[PDB]
Amino acid sequence: IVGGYTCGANTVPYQVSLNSGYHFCGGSLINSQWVVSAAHCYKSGIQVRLGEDNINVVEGNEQFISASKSIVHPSYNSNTLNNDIMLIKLKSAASLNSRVASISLPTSCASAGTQCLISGWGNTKSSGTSYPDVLKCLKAPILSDSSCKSAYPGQITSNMFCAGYLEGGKDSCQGDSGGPVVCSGKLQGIVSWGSGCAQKNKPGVYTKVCNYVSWIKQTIASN
Ligand SMILES: [Ca+2]
């Protein structure tokens, strides 16, 4: 997250770190056994880390649970990032508490202008690299679809939305991929892509979660 703020420990209780020896992506806990992330975050050997603040220090609220199965969306296209969503099942159920908590799925799509919370452990710089050890947060609005298309001609599908600031300075970034965009207590987006980070006229692009609720629910019900 570039241009954000330190969330505070365990203030974002649905945020997870996906770990394969190191943090590589975020995710969102949607029930005691299932995480949503980005399909471009797929790999084997994932350990889900819940209740994290400093990802480099054991602070006492963590739960580390290996993935038993990864399900990338049936129509994911890694060239376009269309349908950039995956589900990860935990080998054992998380113990849910004030610091480790699911986030509800949307019942309708969010509108441009809605305010949301975006969070992650990714790069905090637009030029060069600095990875924070504690979770960072950004409050940002959903942008109109016409502004999103205008920013990224030929690239924005009906499964994507833009959020952030066209003036630059505040955005998600590399290492935030797969993490949440939460609006009014509902998971509306997944950190997906963007041209650099925090650049003028190049807002963040997010997977539009409300298009996937039926797929998520049916997948959980049978897996
Ligand atoms: Ca920790």
UniProtKB/Swiss-Prot annotation:
<feature type="binding site">
    <location>
        <position position="52"/>
    </location>
    <ligand>
        <name>Ca(2+)</name>
    </ligand>
</feature>
<dbReference type="InterPro" id="IPR033116">
    <property type="entry name" value="TRYPSIN_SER"/>
</dbReference>
<keyword id="KW-0378">Hydrolase</keyword>
<feature type="disulfide bond">
    <location>
        <begin position="109"/>
        <end position="210"/>
    </location>
</feature>
<protein>
    <recommendedName>
        <fullName>Serine protease 1</fullName>
        <ecNumber>3.4.21.4</ecNumber>
    </recommendedName>
</protein>
<keyword id="KW-0106">Calcium</keyword>
<dbReference type="GO" id="GO:0007586">
    <property type="term" value="P:digestion"/>
</dbReference>
<keyword id="KW-0865">Zymogen</keyword>
<dbReference type="InterPro" id="IPR043504">
    <property type="entry name" value="Peptidase_S1_PA_chymotrypsin"/>
</dbReference>
<keyword id="KW-0479">Metal-binding</keyword>
<dbReference type="GO" id="GO:0046872">
    <property type="term" value="F:metal ion binding"/>
</dbReference>
<dbReference type="GO" id="GO:0097180">
    <property type="term" value="C:serine protease inhibitor complex"/>
</dbReference>
<dbReference type="InterPro" id="IPR050127">
    <property type="entry name" value="Serine_Proteases_S1"/>
</dbReference>
<keyword id="KW-0645">Protease</keyword>
<feature type="binding site">
    <location>
        <position position="177"/>
    </location>
    <ligand>
        <name>substrate</name>
    </ligand>
</feature>
<dbReference type="Pfam" id="PF00089">
    <property type="entry name" value="Trypsin"/>
</dbReference>
<dbReference type="GO" id="GO:0097655">
    <property type="term" value="F:serpin family protein binding"/>
</dbReference>
<feature type="binding site">
    <location>
        <position position="62"/>
    </location>
    <ligand>
        <name>Ca(2+)</name>
    </ligand>
</feature>
<feature type="active site" description="Charge relay system">
    <location>
        <position position="84"/>
    </location>
</feature>
<dbReference type="GO" id="GO:0004175">
    <property type="term" value="F:endopeptidase activity"/>
</dbReference>
<feature type="domain" description="Peptidase S1">
    <location>
        <begin position="1"/>
        <end position="221"/>
    </location>
</feature>
<dbReference type="InterPro" id="IPR018114">
    <property type="entry name" value="TRYPSIN_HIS"/>
</dbReference>
<keyword id="KW-0222">Digestion</keyword>
<dbReference type="GO" id="GO:0005615">
    <property type="term" value="C:extracellular space"/>
</dbReference>
<feature type="disulfide bond">
    <location>
        <begin position="116"/>
        <end position="183"/>
    </location>
</feature>
<feature type="disulfide bond">
    <location>
        <begin position="173"/>
        <end position="197"/>
    </location>
</feature>
<comment type="subunit">
    <text>Interacts with SERPINA1.</text>
</comment>
<keyword id="KW-0732">Signal</keyword>
<feature type="disulfide bond">
    <location>
        <begin position="7"/>
        <end position="137"/>
    </location>
</feature>
<feature type="active site" description="Charge relay system">
    <location>
        <position position="177"/>
    </location>
</feature>
<keyword id="KW-0964">Secreted</keyword>
<dbReference type="GO" id="GO:0004252">
    <property type="term" value="F:serine-type endopeptidase activity"/>
</dbReference>
<dbReference type="GO" id="GO:0006508">
    <property type="term" value="P:proteolysis"/>
</dbReference>
<feature type="binding site">
    <location>
        <begin position="174"/>
        <end position="175"/>
    </location>
    <ligand>
        <name>substrate</name>
    </ligand>
</feature>
<feature type="binding site">
    <location>
        <position position="57"/>
    </location>
    <ligand>
        <name>Ca(2+)</name>
    </ligand>
</feature>
<dbReference type="InterPro" id="IPR001314">
    <property type="entry name" value="Peptidase_S1A"/>
</dbReference>
<feature type="disulfide bond">
    <location>
        <begin position="148"/>
        <end position="162"/>
    </location>
</feature>
<dbReference type="InterPro" id="IPR009003">
    <property type="entry name" value="Peptidase_S1_PA"/>
</dbReference>
<comment type="similarity">
    <text>Belongs to the peptidase S1 family.</text>
</comment>
<keyword id="KW-0720">Serine protease</keyword>
<feature type="binding site">
    <location>
        <position position="54"/>
    </location>
    <ligand>
        <name>Ca(2+)</name>
    </ligand>
</feature>
<feature type="active site" description="Charge relay system">
    <location>
        <position position="40"/>
    </location>
</feature>
